[PDB]
Short mmCIF file of C-alpha atoms and ligand atoms in Angstrom, two decimals:
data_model
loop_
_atom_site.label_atom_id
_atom_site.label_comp_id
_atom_site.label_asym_id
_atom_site.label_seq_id
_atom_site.Cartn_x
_atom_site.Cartn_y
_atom_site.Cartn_z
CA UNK H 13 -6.54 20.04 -8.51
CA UNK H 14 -7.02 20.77 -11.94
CA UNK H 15 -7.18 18.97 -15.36
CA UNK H 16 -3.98 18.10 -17.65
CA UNK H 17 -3.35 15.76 -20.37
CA UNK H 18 -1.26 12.68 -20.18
CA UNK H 19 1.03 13.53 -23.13
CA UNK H 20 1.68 17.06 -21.16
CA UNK H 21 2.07 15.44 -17.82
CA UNK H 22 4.68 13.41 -18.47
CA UNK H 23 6.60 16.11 -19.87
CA UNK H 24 6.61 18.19 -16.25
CA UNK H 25 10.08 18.61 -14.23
CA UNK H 26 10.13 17.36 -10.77
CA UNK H 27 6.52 16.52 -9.91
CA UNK H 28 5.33 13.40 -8.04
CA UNK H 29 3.15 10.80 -10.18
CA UNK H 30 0.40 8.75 -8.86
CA UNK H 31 -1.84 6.13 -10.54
CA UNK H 32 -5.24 4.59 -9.37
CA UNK H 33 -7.69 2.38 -11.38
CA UNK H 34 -11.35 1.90 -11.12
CA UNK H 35 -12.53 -2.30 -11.18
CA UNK H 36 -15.94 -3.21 -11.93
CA UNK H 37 -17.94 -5.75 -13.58
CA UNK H 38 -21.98 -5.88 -14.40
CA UNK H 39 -24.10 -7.33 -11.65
CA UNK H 40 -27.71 -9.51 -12.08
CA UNK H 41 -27.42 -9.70 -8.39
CA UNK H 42 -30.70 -7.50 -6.41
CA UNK H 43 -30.59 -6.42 -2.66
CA UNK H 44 -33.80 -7.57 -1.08
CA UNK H 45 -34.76 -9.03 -4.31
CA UNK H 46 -35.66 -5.77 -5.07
CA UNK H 47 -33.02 -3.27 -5.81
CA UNK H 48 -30.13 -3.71 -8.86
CA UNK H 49 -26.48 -3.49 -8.08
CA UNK H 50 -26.22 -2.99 -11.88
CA UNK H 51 -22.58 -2.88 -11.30
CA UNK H 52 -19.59 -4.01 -8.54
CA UNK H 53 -17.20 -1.16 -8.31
CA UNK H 54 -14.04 -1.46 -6.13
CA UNK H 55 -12.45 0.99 -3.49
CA UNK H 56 -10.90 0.56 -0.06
CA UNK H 57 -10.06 1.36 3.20
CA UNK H 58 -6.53 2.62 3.44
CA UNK H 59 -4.55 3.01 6.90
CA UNK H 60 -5.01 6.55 6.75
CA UNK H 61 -9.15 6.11 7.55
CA UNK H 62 -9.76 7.09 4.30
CA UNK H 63 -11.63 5.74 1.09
CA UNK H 64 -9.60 5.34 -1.73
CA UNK H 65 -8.87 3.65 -5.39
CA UNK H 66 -6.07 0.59 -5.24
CA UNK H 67 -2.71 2.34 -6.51
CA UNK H 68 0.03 4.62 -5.85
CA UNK H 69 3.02 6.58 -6.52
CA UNK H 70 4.31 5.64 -10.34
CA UNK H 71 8.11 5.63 -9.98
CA UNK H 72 8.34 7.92 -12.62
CA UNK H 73 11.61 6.75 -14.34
CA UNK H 74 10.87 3.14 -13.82
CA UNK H 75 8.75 1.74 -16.01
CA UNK H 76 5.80 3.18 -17.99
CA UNK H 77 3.12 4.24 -15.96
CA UNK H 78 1.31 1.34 -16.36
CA UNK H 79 3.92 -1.04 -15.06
CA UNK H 80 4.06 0.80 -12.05
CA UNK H 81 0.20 0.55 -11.54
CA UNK H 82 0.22 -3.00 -12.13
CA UNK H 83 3.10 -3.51 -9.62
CA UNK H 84 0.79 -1.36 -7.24
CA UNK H 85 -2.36 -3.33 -8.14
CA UNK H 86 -0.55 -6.57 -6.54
CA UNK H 87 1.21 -5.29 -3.45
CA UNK H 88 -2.12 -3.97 -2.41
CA UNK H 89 -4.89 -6.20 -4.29
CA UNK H 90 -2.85 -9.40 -4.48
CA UNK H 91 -1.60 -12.29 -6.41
CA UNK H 92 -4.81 -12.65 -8.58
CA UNK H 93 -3.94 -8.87 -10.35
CA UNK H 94 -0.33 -10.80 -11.87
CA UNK H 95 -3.16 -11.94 -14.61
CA UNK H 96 -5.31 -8.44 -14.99
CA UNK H 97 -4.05 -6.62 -18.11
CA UNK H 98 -4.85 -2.86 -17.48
CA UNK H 99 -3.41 -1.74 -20.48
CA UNK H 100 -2.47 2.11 -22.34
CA UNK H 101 -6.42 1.36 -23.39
CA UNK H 102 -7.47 1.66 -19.70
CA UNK H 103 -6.22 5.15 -19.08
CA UNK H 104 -8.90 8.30 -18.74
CA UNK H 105 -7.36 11.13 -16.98
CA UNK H 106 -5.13 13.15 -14.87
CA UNK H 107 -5.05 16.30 -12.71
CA UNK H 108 -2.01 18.40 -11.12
CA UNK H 109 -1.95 19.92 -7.60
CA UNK H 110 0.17 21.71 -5.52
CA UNK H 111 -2.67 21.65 -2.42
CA UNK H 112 0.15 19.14 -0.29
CA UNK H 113 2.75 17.90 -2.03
CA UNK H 114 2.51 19.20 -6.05
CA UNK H 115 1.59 16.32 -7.61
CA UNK H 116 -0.24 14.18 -10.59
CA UNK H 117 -2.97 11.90 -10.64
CA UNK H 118 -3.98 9.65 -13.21
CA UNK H 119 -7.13 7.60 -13.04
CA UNK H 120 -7.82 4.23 -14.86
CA UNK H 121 -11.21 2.46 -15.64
CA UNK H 122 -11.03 -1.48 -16.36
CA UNK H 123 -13.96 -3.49 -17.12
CA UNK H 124 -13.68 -7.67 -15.74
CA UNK H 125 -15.63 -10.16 -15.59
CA UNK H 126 -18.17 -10.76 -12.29
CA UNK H 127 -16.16 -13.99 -11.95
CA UNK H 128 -13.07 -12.07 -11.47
CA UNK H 129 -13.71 -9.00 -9.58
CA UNK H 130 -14.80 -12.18 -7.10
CA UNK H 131 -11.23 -13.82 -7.15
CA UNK H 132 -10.12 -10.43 -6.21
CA UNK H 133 -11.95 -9.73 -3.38
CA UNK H 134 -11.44 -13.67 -2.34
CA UNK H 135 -7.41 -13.22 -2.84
CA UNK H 136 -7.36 -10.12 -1.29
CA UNK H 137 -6.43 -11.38 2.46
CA UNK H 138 -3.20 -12.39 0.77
CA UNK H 139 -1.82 -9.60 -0.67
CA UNK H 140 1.33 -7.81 1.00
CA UNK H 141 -0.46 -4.45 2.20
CA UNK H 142 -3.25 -6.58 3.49
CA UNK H 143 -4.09 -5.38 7.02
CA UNK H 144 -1.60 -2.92 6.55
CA UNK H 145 -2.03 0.29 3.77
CA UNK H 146 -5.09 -1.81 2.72
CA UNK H 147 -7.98 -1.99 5.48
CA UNK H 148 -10.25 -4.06 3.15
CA UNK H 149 -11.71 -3.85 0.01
CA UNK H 150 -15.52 -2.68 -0.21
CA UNK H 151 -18.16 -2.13 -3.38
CA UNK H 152 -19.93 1.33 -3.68
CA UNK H 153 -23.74 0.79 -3.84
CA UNK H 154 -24.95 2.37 -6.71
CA UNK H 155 -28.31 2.60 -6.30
CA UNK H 156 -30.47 5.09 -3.79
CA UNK H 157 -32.79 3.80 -1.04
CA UNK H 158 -36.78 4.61 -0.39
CA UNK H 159 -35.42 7.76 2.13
CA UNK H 160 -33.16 8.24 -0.92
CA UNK H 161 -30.23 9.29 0.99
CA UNK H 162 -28.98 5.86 1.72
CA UNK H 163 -27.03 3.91 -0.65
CA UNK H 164 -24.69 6.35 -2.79
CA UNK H 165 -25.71 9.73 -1.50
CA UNK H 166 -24.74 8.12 2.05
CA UNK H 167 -21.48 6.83 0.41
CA UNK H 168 -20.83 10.18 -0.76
CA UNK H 169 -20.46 11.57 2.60
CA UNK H 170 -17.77 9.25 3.93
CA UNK H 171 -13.93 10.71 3.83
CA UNK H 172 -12.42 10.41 0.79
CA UNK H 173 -8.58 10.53 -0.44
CA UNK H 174 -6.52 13.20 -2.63
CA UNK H 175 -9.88 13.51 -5.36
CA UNK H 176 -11.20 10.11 -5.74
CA UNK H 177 -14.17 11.02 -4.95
CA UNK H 178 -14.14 13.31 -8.02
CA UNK H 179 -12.91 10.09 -9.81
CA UNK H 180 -15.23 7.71 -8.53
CA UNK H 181 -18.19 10.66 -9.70
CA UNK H 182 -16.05 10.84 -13.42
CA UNK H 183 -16.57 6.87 -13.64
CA UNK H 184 -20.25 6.98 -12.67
CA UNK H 185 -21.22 9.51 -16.08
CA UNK H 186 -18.62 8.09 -17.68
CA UNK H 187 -19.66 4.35 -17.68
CA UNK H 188 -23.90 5.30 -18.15
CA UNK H 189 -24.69 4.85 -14.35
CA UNK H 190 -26.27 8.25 -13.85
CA UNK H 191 -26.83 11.10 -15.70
CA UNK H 192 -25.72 14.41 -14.47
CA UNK H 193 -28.74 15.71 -13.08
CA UNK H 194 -28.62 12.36 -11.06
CA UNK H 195 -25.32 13.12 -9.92
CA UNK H 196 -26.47 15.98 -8.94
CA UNK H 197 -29.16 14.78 -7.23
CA UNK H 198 -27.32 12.44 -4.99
CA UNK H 199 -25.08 15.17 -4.43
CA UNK H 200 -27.58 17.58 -2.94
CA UNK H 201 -29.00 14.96 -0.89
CA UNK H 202 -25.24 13.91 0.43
CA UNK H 203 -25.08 17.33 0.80
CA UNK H 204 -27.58 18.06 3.45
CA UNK R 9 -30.42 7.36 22.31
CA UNK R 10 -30.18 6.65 26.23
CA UNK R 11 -28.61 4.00 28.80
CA UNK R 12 -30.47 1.31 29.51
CA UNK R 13 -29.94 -1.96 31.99
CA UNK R 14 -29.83 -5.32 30.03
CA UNK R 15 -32.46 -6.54 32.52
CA UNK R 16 -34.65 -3.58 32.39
CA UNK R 17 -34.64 -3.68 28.64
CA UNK R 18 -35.93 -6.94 28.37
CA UNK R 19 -38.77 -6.35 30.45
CA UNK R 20 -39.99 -3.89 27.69
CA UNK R 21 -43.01 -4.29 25.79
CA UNK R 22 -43.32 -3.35 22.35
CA UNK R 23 -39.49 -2.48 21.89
CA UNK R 24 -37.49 -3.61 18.78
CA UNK R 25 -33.97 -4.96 20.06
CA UNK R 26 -30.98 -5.29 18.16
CA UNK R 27 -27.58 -7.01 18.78
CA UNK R 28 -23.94 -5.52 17.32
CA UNK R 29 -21.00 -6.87 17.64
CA UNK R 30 -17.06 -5.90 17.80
CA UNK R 31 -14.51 -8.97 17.37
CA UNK R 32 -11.06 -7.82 17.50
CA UNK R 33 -7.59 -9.67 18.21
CA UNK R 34 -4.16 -8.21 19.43
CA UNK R 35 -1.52 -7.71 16.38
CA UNK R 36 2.46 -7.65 16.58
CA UNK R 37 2.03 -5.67 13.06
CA UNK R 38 3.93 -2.38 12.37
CA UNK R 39 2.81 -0.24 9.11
CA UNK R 40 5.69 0.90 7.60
CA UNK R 41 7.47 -1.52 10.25
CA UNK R 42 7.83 1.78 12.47
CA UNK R 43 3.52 2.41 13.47
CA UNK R 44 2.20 -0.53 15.92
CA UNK R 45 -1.37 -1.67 14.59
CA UNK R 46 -1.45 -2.69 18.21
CA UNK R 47 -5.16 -4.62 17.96
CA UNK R 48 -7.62 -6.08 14.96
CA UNK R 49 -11.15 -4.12 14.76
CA UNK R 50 -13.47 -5.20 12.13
CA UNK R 51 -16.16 -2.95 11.22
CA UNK R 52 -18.20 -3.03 7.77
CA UNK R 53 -19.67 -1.18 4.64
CA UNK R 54 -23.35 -1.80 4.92
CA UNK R 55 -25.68 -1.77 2.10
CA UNK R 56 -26.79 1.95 3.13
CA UNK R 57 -23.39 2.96 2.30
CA UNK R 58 -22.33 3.39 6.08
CA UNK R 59 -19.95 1.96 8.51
CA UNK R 60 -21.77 -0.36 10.75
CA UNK R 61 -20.90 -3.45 12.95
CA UNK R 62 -22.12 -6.78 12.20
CA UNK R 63 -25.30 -8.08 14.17
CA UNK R 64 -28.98 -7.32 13.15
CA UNK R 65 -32.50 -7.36 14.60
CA UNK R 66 -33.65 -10.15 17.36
CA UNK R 67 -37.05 -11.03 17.83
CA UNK R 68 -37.11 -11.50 21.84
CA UNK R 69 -40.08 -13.61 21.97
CA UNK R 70 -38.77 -16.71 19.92
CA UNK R 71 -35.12 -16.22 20.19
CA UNK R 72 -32.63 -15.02 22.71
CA UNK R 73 -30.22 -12.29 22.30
CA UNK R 74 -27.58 -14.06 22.06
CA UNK R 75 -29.27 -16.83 19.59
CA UNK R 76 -29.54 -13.96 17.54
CA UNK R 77 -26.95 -12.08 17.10
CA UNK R 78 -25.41 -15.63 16.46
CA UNK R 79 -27.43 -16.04 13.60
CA UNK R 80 -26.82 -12.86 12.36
CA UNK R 81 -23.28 -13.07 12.34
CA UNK R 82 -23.14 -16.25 10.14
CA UNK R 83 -25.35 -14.64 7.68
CA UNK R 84 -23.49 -11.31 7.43
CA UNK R 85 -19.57 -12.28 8.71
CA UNK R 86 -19.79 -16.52 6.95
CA UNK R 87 -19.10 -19.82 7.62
CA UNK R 88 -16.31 -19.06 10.19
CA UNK R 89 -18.45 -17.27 13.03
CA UNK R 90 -19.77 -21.10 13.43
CA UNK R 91 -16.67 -21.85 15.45
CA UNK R 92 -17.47 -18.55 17.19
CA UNK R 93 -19.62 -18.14 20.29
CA UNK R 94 -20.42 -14.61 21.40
CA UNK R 95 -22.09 -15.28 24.91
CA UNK R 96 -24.07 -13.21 27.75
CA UNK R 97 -20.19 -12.71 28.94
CA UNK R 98 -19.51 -11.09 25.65
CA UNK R 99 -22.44 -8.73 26.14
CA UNK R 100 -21.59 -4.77 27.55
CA UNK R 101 -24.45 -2.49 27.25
CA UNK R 102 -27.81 -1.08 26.09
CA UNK R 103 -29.36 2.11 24.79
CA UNK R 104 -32.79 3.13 24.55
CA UNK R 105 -34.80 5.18 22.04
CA UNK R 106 -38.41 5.87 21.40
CA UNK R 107 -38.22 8.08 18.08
CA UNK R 108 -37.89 7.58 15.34
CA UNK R 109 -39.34 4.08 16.22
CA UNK R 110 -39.23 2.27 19.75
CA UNK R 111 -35.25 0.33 19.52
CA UNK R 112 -33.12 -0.92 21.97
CA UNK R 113 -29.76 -1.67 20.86
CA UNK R 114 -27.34 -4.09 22.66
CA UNK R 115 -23.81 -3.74 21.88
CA UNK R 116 -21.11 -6.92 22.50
CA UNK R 117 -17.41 -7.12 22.47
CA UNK R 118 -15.03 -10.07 21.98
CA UNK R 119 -11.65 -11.25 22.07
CA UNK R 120 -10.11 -13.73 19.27
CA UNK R 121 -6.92 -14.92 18.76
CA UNK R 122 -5.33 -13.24 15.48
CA UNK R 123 -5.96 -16.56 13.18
CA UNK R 124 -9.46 -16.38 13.83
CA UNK R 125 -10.10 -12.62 12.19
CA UNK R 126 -7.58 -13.45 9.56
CA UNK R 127 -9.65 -16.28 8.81
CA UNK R 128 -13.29 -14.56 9.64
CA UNK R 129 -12.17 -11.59 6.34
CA UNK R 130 -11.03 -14.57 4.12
CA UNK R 131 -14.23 -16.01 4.70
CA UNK R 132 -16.32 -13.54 4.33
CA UNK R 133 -16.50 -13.83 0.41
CA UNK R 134 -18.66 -16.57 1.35
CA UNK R 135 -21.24 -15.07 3.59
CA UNK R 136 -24.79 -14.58 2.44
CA UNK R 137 -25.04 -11.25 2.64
CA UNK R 138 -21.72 -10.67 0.67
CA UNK R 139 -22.21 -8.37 -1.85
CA UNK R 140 -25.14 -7.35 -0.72
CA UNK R 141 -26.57 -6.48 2.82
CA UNK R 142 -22.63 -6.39 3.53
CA UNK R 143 -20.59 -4.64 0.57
CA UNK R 144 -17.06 -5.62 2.53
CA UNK R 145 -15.59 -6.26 6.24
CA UNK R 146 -12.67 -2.96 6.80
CA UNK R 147 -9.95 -2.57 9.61
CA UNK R 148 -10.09 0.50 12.16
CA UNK R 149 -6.80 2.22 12.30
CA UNK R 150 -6.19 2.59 15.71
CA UNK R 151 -2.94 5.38 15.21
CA UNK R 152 -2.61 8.66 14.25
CA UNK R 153 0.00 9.26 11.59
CA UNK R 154 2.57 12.82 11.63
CA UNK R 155 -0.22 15.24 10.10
CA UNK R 156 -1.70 14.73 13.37
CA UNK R 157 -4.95 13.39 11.25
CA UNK R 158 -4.23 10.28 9.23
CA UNK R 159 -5.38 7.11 11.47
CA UNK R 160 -8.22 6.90 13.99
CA UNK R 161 -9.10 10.60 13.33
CA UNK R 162 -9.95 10.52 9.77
CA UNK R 163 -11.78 7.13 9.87
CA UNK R 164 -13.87 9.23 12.70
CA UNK R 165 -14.75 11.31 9.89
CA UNK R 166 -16.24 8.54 7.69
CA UNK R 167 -20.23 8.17 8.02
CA UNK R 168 -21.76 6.25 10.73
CA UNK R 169 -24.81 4.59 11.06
CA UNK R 170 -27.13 5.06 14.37
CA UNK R 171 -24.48 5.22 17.72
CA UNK R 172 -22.09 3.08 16.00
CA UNK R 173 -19.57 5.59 16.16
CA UNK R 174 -20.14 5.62 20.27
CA UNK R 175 -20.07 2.20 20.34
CA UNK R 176 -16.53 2.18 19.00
CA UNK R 177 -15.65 4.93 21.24
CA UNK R 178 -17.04 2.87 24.01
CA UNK R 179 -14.78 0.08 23.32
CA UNK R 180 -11.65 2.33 22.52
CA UNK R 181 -12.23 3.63 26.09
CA UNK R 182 -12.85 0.17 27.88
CA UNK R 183 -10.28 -1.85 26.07
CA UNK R 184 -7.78 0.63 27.22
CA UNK R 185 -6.84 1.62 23.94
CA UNK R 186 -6.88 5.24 24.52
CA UNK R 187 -7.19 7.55 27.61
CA UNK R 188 -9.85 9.90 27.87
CA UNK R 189 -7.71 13.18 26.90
CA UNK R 190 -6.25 11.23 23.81
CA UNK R 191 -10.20 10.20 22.89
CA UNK R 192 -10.88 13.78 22.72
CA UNK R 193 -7.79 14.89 20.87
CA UNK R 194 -8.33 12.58 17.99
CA UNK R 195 -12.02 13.53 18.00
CA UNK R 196 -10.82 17.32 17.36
CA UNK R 197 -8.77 16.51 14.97
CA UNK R 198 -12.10 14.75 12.93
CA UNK R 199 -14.30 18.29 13.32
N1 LIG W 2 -6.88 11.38 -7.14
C1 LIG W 2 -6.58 10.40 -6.28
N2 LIG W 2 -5.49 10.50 -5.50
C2 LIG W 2 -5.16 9.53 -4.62
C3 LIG W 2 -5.94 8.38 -4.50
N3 LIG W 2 -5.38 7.61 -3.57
C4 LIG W 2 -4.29 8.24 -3.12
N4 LIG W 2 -4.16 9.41 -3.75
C5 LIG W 2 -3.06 10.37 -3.55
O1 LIG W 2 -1.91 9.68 -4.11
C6 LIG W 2 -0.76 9.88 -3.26
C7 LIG W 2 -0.10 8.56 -2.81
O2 LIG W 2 -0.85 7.38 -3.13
P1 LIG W 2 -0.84 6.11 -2.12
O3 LIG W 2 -1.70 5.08 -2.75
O4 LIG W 2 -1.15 6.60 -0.76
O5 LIG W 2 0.69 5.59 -2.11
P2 LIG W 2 1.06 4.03 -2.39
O6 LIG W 2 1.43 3.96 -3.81
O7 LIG W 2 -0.02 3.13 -1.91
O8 LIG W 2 2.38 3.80 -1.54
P3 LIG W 2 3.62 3.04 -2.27
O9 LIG W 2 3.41 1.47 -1.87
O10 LIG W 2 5.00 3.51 -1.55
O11 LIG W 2 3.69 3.26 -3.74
C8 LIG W 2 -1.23 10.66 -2.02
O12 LIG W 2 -0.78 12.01 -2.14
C9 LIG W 2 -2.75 10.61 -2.08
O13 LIG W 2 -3.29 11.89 -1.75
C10 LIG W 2 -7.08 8.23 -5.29
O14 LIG W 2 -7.78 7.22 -5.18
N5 LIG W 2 -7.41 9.26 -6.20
N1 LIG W 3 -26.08 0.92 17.54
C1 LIG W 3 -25.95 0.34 16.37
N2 LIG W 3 -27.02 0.26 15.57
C2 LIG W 3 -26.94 -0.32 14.37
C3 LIG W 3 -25.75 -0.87 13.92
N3 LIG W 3 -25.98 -1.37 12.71
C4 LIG W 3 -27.26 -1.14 12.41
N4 LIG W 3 -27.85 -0.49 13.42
C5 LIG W 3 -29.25 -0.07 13.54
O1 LIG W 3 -29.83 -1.27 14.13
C6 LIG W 3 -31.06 -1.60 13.42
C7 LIG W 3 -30.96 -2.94 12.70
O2 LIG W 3 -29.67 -3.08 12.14
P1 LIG W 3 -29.36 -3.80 10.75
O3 LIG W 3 -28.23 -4.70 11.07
O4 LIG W 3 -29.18 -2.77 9.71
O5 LIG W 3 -30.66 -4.70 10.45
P2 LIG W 3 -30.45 -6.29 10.07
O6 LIG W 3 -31.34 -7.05 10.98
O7 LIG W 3 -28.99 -6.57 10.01
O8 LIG W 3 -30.99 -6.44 8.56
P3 LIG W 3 -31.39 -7.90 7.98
O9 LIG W 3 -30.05 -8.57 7.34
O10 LIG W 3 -32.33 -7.59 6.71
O11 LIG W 3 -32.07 -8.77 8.98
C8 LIG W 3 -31.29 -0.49 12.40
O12 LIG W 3 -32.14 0.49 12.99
C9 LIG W 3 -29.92 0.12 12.19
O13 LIG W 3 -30.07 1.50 11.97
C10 LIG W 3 -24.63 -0.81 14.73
O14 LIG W 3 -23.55 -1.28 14.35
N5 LIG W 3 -24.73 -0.20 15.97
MN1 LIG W 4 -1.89 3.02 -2.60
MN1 LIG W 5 1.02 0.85 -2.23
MN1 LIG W 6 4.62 1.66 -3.59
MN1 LIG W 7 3.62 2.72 0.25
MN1 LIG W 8 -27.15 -6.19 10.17
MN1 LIG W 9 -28.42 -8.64 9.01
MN1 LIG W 10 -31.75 -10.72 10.16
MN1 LIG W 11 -29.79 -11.36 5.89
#
């Protein structure tokens, strides 16, 4: 896994492309009245037992690469996604690999409403990979617990796909959820 | 933890009990219309970031078990579970610890018919804890894919809370899911 540019990545002979796209909307909601979830962020359960980002393979000489996530974001979120725009705007990075099957990976980050990340999760039952390469949807607890290895450090130690887990950690700095030395943190405690 | 009796359990003083619970249905389903998903298992993300079943703590001295894993299930699975009645025939075992902190957890299994945990995860949305105590109901893959790890094995991987994770073996085991050797072969394949 390492870092390349869209503009170069799309210029590479042969390789397999692969999108995946971060949902979240802000969050007045508290857990025991007590704790902020700040944020909803989406992943999922995929049929392989792993975690995951909703997505997939970009049929390279379809359509752009954002057609092919959208297409992606409705076989496996549903039918509310034919109305989520997720545009050129809504792209952040890629990486290359050769680890299993030499490949590229580009993550996307789209702010919704609350309202609508809601729908989402409410459609969800309906959409074709439902029960099938979706195992449901679930929201990553941002916050750390009074033993402060529950919440997100405990998230961090469930089995992640391909480098989501890298991703999800990109989208946490990158949206002003933790600092580094946080991430760190929760790291170290995940860790051990 | 340790086995424990139902009986013997509740003639404990100063114990904290709690009840779990897996529903599950059979399913004519085939991923990639070639893999049989064979039976439904729901299992959640809890709060704590951890895979958990649903059920909670049950204060024996105003409420029965079963009273309160039925309550616990409304507020954590929604409005469906009150068509839902986990009984005493539901119930299958008990273990025992003193430390951390004195717990005795009772684990329950049911049968539904496949409309009933479609319509349990639609519902679910709606459930108080939604969102919060309960951050989204999953499946458990019951296959293993061709890498000999995708499936069962890899979700084996994922992080457990208490003996959740021998609870599920338990019922893999005594629904006759898998056979002992092919329990221990997909648990190799996890470590
Ligand atoms: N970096 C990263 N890679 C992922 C993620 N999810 C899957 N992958 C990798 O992307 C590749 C395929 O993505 P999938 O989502 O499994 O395929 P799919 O698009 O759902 O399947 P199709 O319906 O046929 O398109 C695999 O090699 C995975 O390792 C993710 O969230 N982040
Ligand atoms: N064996 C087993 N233990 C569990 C499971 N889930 C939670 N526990 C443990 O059982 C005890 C209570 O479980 P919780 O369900 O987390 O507590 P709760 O009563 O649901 O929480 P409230 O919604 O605030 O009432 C805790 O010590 C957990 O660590 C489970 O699925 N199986
Ligand atoms: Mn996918
Ligand atoms: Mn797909
Ligand atoms: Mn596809
Ligand atoms: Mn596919
Ligand atoms: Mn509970
Ligand atoms: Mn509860
Ligand atoms: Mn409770
Ligand atoms: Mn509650």
């Amino acid at each position: 896994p390492r870092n390349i540019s869209r503009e170069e990545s799309l210029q590479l002979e042969g390789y397999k492309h692969a999108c995946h796209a971060l949902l979240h909307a802000p969050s007045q909601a508290k857990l025991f009245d007590r704790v902020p979830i700040r944020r909803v962020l989406l992943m999922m359960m995929r049929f392989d037992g792993r975690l995951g980002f909703p997505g997939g393979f970009v049929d390279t000489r379809d359509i752009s690469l954002e057609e092919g996530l959208k297409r992606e974001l409705e076989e496996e979120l549903g039918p509310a996604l034919a109305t989520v725009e997720v545009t050129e705007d809504d792209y952040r990075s890629s990486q290359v690999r050769e680890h299993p099957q030499k490949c590229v990976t580009h993550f996307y980050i789209k702010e919704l409403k609350l309202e609508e990340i809601e729908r989402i999760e409410a459609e969800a039952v309906n959409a074709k990979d439902h029960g099938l390469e979706v195992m449901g949807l679930i929201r990553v607890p941002l916050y750390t617990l009074r033993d402060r290895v529950g919440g997100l450090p405990a998230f961090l130690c469930n089995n992640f796909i391909g480098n989501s887990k890298s991703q999800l950690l990109y989208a946490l700095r990158s949206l002003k959820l933790l600092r580094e030395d946080q991430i760190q943190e929760v790291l170290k405690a995940s860790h051990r």
